[PDB]
Design a protein around this ligand. Structure first.
Ligand SMILES: *[C@@H]1O[C@H](CO)[C@@H](O[C@@H]2O[C@H](CO)[C@@H](O[C@@H]3O[C@H](CO)[C@@H](O)[C@H](O)[C@@H]3O)[C@H](O)[C@H]2NC(C)=O)[C@H](O)[C@H]1NC(C)=O
Ligand SMILES: *[C@@H]1O[C@H](CO)[C@@H](O)[C@H](O)[C@H]1NC(C)=O
Lengths: 293, 164
């Protein structure tokens, strides 16, 4: 039994029918009181009497919100390990199978990581840098918020949470030596799990859609766009590439233009432009479509 | 100027070379990207500290015929000089790996990339480890992934020197 918080404890169980649950005693947080009673949030009546209550934790029923009687509270969380591997049941993976999808709109240090939950009840999330080694990049993240936009995958829709993170600004470097190592703690009711990821900003760069898309009739039209305002500056150093199509990184029937403009031929068609880092084969922007006269 | 075309060609010859790598060296963790990013110039390079635009240097606490004659900077001079040493280091490693690979089929280093690092080295200028057959293949992939990220940094610098 290890201490996650002051009155919230996590116990790791072998989750094998023959394995004996770990025996650990929990006492009421009031030192001098005697003749107390005990309950659990999954039990109706009293289940303990002494100032300290031993407990054997093999199943989920043996865990919950143990409340003195209301002198104090204690919470038990289970982290299953089955055949030596820990459970990954709270979160739902993407088609990639990554449990955490991080992406950055620029090279500033800001980035957002998002994840899908199988089942959205009594969920508490905490994300932080996973390495305390001195040679480690420091990242501080805010709190996780649920997204009104659900996500569909394998003929099923899932709810999505996300968090904004920011690398503690040091002096700039042209490349990234060590990866950013993050870890997420997920807490379904009476279940604890943790997920980790390692990434470089250069690989999570997803440029924002192009802005100010205009077109001028030519002999044949000149389609002109502009770099996203969220993109890093100087744009000369942080060059972008643009794929154009008429009607991520699908580029089906699409051509490349490394400038802010090109000349396409369309009638009654809609022209679309996406962006990407000119040099690193990173993620491509969402399409910024516009009709063509 | 005009060193931009050599950095672009180096980017092209490197990208289609790593494509040749993660295709022929399948199931070598090459395409899996699980291989750790290993910089071979880490000990003697000033590329990461210097090869940055002057606009990003906002705090005080932080030859070759490629630098623009209009704007000359000591930091940019150090950047171009460090890039030269990086390419030479990768040249010696690649030439040694190519010797072992040419004897043993699956992979061969692109002559275009090897002449691209040299032509860019000359514009900037105005003994190798031991490995077995399986290990020399892995080493090439780890080098190619790090070399791709370094050429990307070079191309950003050259693009910044031009048009500015
Ligand atoms: C992700 O989950 C795993 C498994 O729940 C966590 O590993 C566990 O972490 C706790 C707290 O760091 C460890 O408790 C400590 O155990 C040592 C054992 O000598 C004890 O001396 C300390 O006082 C403390 O109680 C626990 O042993 C450890 N269990 C295993 C199997 O590794 C892990 O920390 C979680 N987080 C990450 C980022 O992995
Ligand atoms: C510049 O100095 C200020 C004040 O000390 C500090 O807050 C900031 O992080 C520094 N910026 C960089 C890039 O080091």
């Amino acid at each position: 039994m290890w201490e996650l918080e002051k009155d919230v404890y996590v116990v790791e169980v072998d989750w094998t029918p023959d394995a004996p649950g770990e025996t650990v005693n929990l006492t009421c947080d009031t030192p001098e009181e005697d003749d107390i009673t005990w309950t659990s949030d999954q039990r109706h009546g009293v289940i303990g009497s002494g100032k300290t209550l031993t407990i054997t934790v093999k199943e989920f029923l043996d865990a919950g919100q143990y409340t003195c009687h209301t002198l104090s509270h204690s919470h038990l969380l289970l982290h299953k390990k089955e055949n030596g591997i820990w459970s990954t049941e709270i979160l739902k993976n993407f088609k990639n199978k990554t449990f955490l999808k991080c992406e950055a709109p620029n090279y500033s240090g800001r980035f957002t990581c998002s994840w899908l939950v199988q089942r959205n009840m009594d969920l508490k999330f905490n994300i932080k840098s996973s390495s305390s080694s001195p040679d480690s990049r420091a990242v501080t993240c805010g709190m996780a918020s649920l997204s009104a936009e659900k996500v569909t995958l394998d003929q099923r829709d899932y709810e999505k949470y996300s968090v904004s993170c920011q690398e503690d600004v040091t002096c700039p470097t042209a490349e990234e030596t060590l990866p950013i190592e993050l870890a997420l703690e997920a807490r379904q009711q009476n279940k604890y799990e943790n997920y980790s990821t390692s990434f470089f900003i250069r690989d999570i760069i997803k440029p924002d859609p192009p802005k100010n898309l205009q077109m001028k009739p030519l002999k044949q039209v000149e389609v002109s766009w502009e770099y996203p305002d969220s993109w890093s500056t100087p744009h000369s150093y942080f060059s972008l590439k643009f794929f154009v199509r008429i009607q991520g990184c699908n580029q089906k029937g699409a051509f490349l233009v490394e400038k802010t403009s090109t000349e396409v031929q369309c009638k009654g068609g809609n022209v679309c432009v996406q962006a990407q880092d000119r040099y690193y084969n990173s993620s491509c922007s969402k399409w910024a479509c516009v009709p063509c006269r | 100027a005009r060193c931009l075309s050599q950095s672009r060609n180096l980017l092209k010859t490197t990208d289609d070379m790593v494509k040749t790598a993660r295709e022929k060296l399948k199931h070598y963790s090459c395409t899996a990207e699980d291989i750790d990013h290993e910089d071979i110039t880490r000990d003697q390079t000033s590329t990461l500290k210097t090869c940055l635009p002057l606009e990003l240097h906002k705090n005080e606490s932080c030859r070759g015929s490629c630098l623009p004659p209009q704007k000359t900077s000591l930091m940019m001079t150090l950047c171009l000089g460090s890039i030269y040493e990086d390419l030479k280091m990768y040249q010696t490693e690649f030439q040694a790996i190519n010797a072992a690979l040419q004897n043993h089929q699956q992979i061969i280093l692109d002559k275009g990339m090897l002449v691209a690092i040299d032509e860019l080295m000359q514009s900037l200028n105005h003994p190798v480890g031991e490995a077995d057959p399986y290990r020399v293949k892995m080493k090439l992939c780890i080098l190619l992934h790090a070399f791709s990220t370094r050429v990307v940094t070079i191309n950003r610098v050259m693009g910044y020197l031009s048009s500015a």
